[PDB]
């Protein structure tokens, strides 16, 4: 799934329903 | 390398049950497996293992399936429930994590039943 470093979207959470 | 009961029964599930739930989503529209997408290393991120009582994610389950840690998917599944258990332990309540994980174990068996019917007819 990863061929190198970088590429990471976390920030806060991830669980569904999360929308702003 | 999987063996256990039937090499496919486990390997087949490796891709079937594992995929089904990780591709699975919740009523909101997003992965129920979201919180179980990845289990650290049981050594590398002990905090996760400290907080949880029985950590194991969809990844670790498949990991164990072929690792001969199950020899039977009913065991994998039990970990799938544990996968959901780590849900209520690690994430926050009132969040999709709890209802999602519960749904995971549910999808799991739904996928387990169709799986068997797919490995017959």
Structural domains of chain B, count:
1
The CATH number of the domain holding residue B49 is: 1.20.920.10
Distance CA B84, CA B57 (A): 8
- Expressed as residue numbers, the domain containing B27 is 1-121
Q: Tell me the shortest Cα–Cα distance from B118 to chain A, in angstroms.
A: 28
Residues B112 and B17: beta-carbon distance below 8 Å: yes
Residue of chain B whose Cα is closest to the Cα of A16? B30
Q: Which residues contact B64 (CB under 8 A, 6 or more apart)?
A: B56, B70, B75, B76, B79
Q: Tell me the shortest Cα–Cα distance from A13 to chain B, in angstroms.
A: 9
Q: Which residues contact A20 (CB under 8 A, 6 or more apart)?
A: none
């Amino acid at each position: 799934a990863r061929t190198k470093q970088t590429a990471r979207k976390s920030t806060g959470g991830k669980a569904p329903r999360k929308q702003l | 390398s999987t063996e256990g009961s039937s090499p496919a029964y486990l390997k087949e599930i490796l891709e079937q049950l594992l995929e089904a739930i990780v591709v699975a989503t919740n009523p909101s529209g997003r992965l129920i497996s979201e919180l179980f997408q990845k289990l650290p290393s049981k050594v590398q991120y002990p905090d996760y293992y400290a907080i949880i009582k029985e950590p194991i994610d969809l990844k670790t389950i498949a990991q164990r399936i072929q690792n001969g840690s199950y020899k039977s998917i009913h065991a994998m599944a039990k970990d799938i429930d544990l996968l959901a258990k780590n849900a209520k332990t690690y994430n926050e309540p009132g969040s999709q994590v709890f209802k999602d994980a519960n749904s995971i174990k549910k999808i799991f068996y739904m996928k387990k039943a169709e799986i068997e019917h797919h490995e017959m007819a």
